Amino acid sequence: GLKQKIVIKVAMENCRSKAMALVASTGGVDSVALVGDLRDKIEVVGYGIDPIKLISALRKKVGDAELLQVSQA
Amino acid sequence: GPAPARFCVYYDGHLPATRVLLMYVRIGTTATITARGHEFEVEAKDQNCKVILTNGKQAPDWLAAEPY
């Protein structure tokens, strides 16, 4: 339906690559970019993405992750 | 045998030990990459993951992609 943008800050100090591939492999994702000065944030764009499941998988497999933004932009 | 790649993965650089990871783009979609302070709108066309600007022009030599 509506195009999403989701930004997640992830603690990933290999860890960046892992985090990015997990996000790419999530349902509904069209793109995944590293953003921020420290390249410690992930911007996800797509449709019908479930942010709750996405945050728990990141926390499960990679490290602490928190939602910075969710916008149906 | 493996499924066809679903994404093209873009890098600034061609060498695994030094390249910088930029973005994953779903094959069949277009996305805007930000790199070296500029924007590049790419089309991830297929599993060969040629770097393709949506305006038909030549992309910079340093922009590389491979299938995931």
Author numbering:
A (entry chain A): 186 to 198, 201 to 260
B (entry chain B): 18 to 85
Can you list sentences taken from the study reporting this PDB entry?
Two paired rice NLR immune receptors are known that contain an integrated heavy metal-associated (HMA) domain, Pik-1/Pik-2 and RGA5/RGA4. M. oryzae secretes a large repertoire of effector proteins, and many of these, including the structurally characterized AVR–Pizt, AVR–Pia, AVR–Pik, AVR1–CO39, and AVR–Pib, share a conserved structure comprising a six-stranded β-sandwich known as the MAX (Magnaporthe Avrs and ToxB-like) fold. Direct interaction between the Pik–HMA domain and AVR–Pik is required for triggering an immune response to the effector. Here, we reveal that Pikp is able to trigger partial disease resistance to the “mis-matched” effector AVR–Pia in rice and elicits a weak cell death response in Nicotiana benthamiana.
To visualize the interface formed between Pikp–HMA and AVR–Pia, and compare it to that with AVR–Pik, we purified the complex between these proteins and determined the structure to 1.9 Å resolution using X-ray crystallography. Pikp–HMA comprises two adjacent α-helices opposite a four-stranded β-sheet. Previous structures of AVR–Pia were determined by NMR spectroscopy, and the crystal structure determined here is very similar (0.92 Å over 65 aligned residues), comprising the six-stranded β-sandwich characteristic of MAX effectors. As observed previously, a disulfide bond is formed between residues Cys-25 and Cys-66. Whereas Pikp–HMA binds AVR–PikD opposite the face of its β-sheet, it binds AVR–Pia adjacent to α-1 and β-2. Another striking feature is that whereas Pikp–HMA is a dimer in the structure with AVR–PikD, it is a monomer with AVR–Pia. The interface formed between Pikp–HMA and AVR–Pia covers an area of 460 Å2 (as calculated by PISA), approximately half of that seen between Pikp–HMA and AVR–PikD (986 Å2 (12)). Furthermore, the interface between Pikp–HMA and AVR–Pia is dominated by hydrogen bonds between the peptide backbone, with the main contributions derived from Pikp–HMAAsp-217, Pikp–HMAVal-219, AVR–PiaTyr-41, and AVR–PiaArg-43. Intriguingly, although Pikp–HMA binds AVR–Pia at a different interface to AVR–PikD, it uses the same interface that RGA5–HMA uses to bind AVR1–CO39 (29).
